[model samples]
Target chain A: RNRFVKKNGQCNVEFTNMADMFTTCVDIRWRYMLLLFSLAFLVSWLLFGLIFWLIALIHGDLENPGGDDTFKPCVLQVNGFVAAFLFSIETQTTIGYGFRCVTEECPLAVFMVVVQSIVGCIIDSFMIDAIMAKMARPKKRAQTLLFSHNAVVAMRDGKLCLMWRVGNLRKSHIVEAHVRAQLIKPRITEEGEYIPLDQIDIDVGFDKGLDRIFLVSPITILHEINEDSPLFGISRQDLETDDFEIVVILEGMVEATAMTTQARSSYLASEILWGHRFEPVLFEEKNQYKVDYSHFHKTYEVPSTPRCSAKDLVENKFLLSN
Target chain B: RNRFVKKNGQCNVEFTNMADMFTTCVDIRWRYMLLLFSLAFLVSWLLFGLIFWLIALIHGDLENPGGDDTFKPCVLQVNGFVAAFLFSIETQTTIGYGFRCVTEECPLAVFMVVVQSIVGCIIDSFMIDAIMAKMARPKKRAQTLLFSHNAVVAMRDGKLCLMWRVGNLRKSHIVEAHVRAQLIKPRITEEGEYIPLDQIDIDVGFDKGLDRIFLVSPITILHEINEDSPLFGISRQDLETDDFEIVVILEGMVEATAMTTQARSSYLASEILWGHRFEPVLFEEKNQYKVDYSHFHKTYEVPSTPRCSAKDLVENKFLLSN
Candidate 1:
């Protein structure tokens, strides 16, 4: 069956568990989260300031007459409503400039201070954590990370290499980008215990275990099929009949923010173009290198035997020779 | 290596290509999108109404004189600025209530009608599509589709079987649900062409190809370790070290909307517990069957041989008899 994805090219299933939702706040964007944070601060300040103003009103200290003279006379020596609101802001933010403060005569004023201080501290802590988390969200950077539309298995360097393309669309490069590929499948033990699914390492290029890849431009990551590979002796027909997935993971730190971001994608058998190759996305024009994103997902057919997969053709030759 | 996932229980890398972002508004939640949509409508109405009001004010048409004594007697039949704003909304919505409309005397009113009608129609179409898409989002219903934290290999009905639990956390049932399981792995062909991954189908139950699973109660989906199973002859240690994943997909029609919804999850080798079985999630209370979701992911150790897997013991007996 052809792989089914959403119209947005996202997987139909997100696979996020319930417990994780509480921590991630995946429901809103960072901008909206920031907006709500600001709104909360403003509302809190105004609410507490109203309490202070009312207390002053009741005590017949509407304004502290003959005090700074610059500010409207209020019982608390604060200028006016604006000053009370500003005082609340200062209290909540813990920026005690000593411009205005609660008086000893009003118990509710003290109570309001205590309440605002505690609540303000809590809100401050929460907002900071949430905003920091939002800023560090890999999703923001992941937006510009690009993956090839499909994986391809074609001849390269006189041997067949399964290859796929990755590119960084943004201007800033990802530092020390790492790429890893895995072949996930199912296995049953001789003991009759079944591992419904299992994963095996697929070497991407001759990295010698250092999976670094440059992402300043579109680059193809390749894995050579060899004796140690799980794909050994399997034909295209076999793959079509069986179920498997090639999962690729890419990770790196953003050069601008020094924050880590990881991107991943998987190719089902159907998404693997057995006899095709990717078109070049980068080009030289006007004495400068240019990337034609329009051609990013384009692939062209290459000469190859159609019916038998590469594995089947090789085994058939060995058998005939023997 | 143990499987690593985000705190949200999602894979670290999500490989959506850049082009897809443009086509799908994947960033914002539906509610935020709706709020923005409403704001756009409001802003358009106000903007066009202000233009019309300015045109009227420049013409010295403060009141529709001799039209309706009750309507402030403005030169234009439109009552006032607020009424003009409402008129803009009506024109954009194409709802000509006949109470107040553009007069033949004001070419600006005619111009506003033409522009507002065109822009409003386009916005209306877009909003309908977006809102309908949002309402049909399966994300909400997917929240209730629960999978067991771990799979277990244990004896069932005198035979060894690989089992996992699936439950619907909601009180409502999903209609005509179907389930599928796949073993995904890496395949390297004899020709040295890597199929970074491939999948093989697994029978979910002994239903003779029927995959329907009633989600009214939690059900245990099992894959019997028969000769046809890919897991028929693997050793326990082989499974312990080998990488593989079992992916399960469940599809059903939501009883509420009759729309299709899909949920999927994968279990790694480490997530499979040997010699363990799921505790019963269904209880008998008041002569009615009740589901206890708290016990959905719970498992208990069952009696089995130490260090030797059930498959190993069976093969050992077969060798002795042989």
Candidate 2:
């Protein structure tokens, strides 16, 4: 139903480690990210505004606003704290309203503008990075990679095979996709050692290179229930009592960005069908193959499927041959 | 020297496809991107400023500024085109300087502010996406995935094998890395078909699943010169004259972003040594494995390697056994 691995712990990356902190910011909720960016800009503006107001106070420009054109000021027309803030905003945003202009008399004011300009650019770039990373997260790509609602056990080349369907819903394909499955179950060893979540590999033709597929169309991945398989002894009777979970993982590079993405889905014992086959979702339409996503999760019963375990069937066949 | 696939022709993904256009913006040079964003903001501001000025002009605020405080202008203090422009900047940036502000009397002005705010957020998000995509490109990640300067041909398990070393320079590991190699050379088919670049797969133990690796440290990948191998009959003499290029590809997900990244390097025949092996780069230190990157690209001579091809060596051994 869902991925088995779920992290439920807090990781405190100290703010001093700005790179890590930025990543945290990038991963945080959009509401919080926006508020943080807004507050950052506001705080910087306020800090610089205070400095500008102090400069004006030191130059006695705030006290001698009525002295007219003859009064030489550090920052012209900046007679109050509000005006200082306005000037700060104008400078940082490059609005250049031309009303609250910085004068040649105050190199400190010019230097402050230059410093704020660089700081503004730095903050702007950080904002861009955080926003872009959040929007273009590779995790979002996995949402379009669909997995079937249920897995099925059916006959394939005279052997019962566990099969599941996976399809990419987007026009963009995943390049060089490789599928892997693992059976996770808890068990007690012969020595009475308790093991939680013992993982067993469910081979999807790794020997024949069938694990890799061109995912332009919906494809069924099957794990043959041979003697070496984890599901070798599982039958229709055992399916009702089995508690193992099968986790399927599909990983590939996204065609659009060439970035790696992984889509995962799991099937609990209850979600596995005993004797069924997935409905065909592909059809020839003119010169191309049309994939019908509507039938992606649909499956039909296979009456020829045996109720006995693959191991028992193989053993019975050998005995009969002898 | 760089990537083999260099797109020389221009692809015009018309502006109608905003999605494609945005991708183009993300990929363009930073200078051009910044200029474009700046121009976009400036144009929007200017267009809205003109509308504000027109509204103020219609309200006769510019012509009757001295009428008194009770005059109730459409936008307070916005008595001229310059003041209207300043008000537009102040509203868009959310500076709210209080010197020039919209009056409740202007519903159109309020609507403009709401529309501009939404538009501003949209543009800001686009800016962030463009800058972030440029900064966190997967291609940049590939730069740290280094391949050895030269490929080596030496004896491994009593068989001639071609090998190369690859290492991750960054502390972060690439997850589920898979390596593949292809030999590209011009060839003619028996049916008289000329193939400019005939690609032959160089097995890096794909059949045995050795192609996959946990790339936390430097590792040497080898391709045995078996009878089925393209280099089966290529000896020291043939190596010097061979024109084929072996292109190696490593694909994996970046641990930080979980995005797929692919690193590629190619070795021309001249770059492949006849009888050499890569130096050992890993060492045990204080119960931990220490990888020395200094020896990553270094190779040692293997004097015992045969001067003849693997095919000849195998045939000679067969005759001796008889």
Provide DockQ values for all models, in the order shown. 0.01, 0.08
lDDT against true structure, model 2: 0.73
Which stretches of candidate 1 lie above 4 Å from their native place? A1-322, B1-12, B16-27, B30-35, B50-54, B57-104, B107-130, B138-142, B184-201, B205-207, B226-230, B238-240, B305-314
lDDT of 1 by residue, B1-322 (tens): 2222211233222222332321243335777787888899989999987777676676555654234433322224455687667666666665545355344345455445545654664455456555544554323434567878787787777666778777887787888787766665545555444433344556675255456787788988887776667666654676688687776666666676555554556787767787788888788898888877788889888766234555675777789987
The model with the greatest TM-score is 2
- TM-score, chain B, model 1, is 0.72
TM-score of each candidate's B chain against the true B chain: 0.72, 0.88
Candidate 1 chain A weakest lDDT stretch, 10 residues: A1-10
Best by lDDT: 2
Best by DockQ: 2
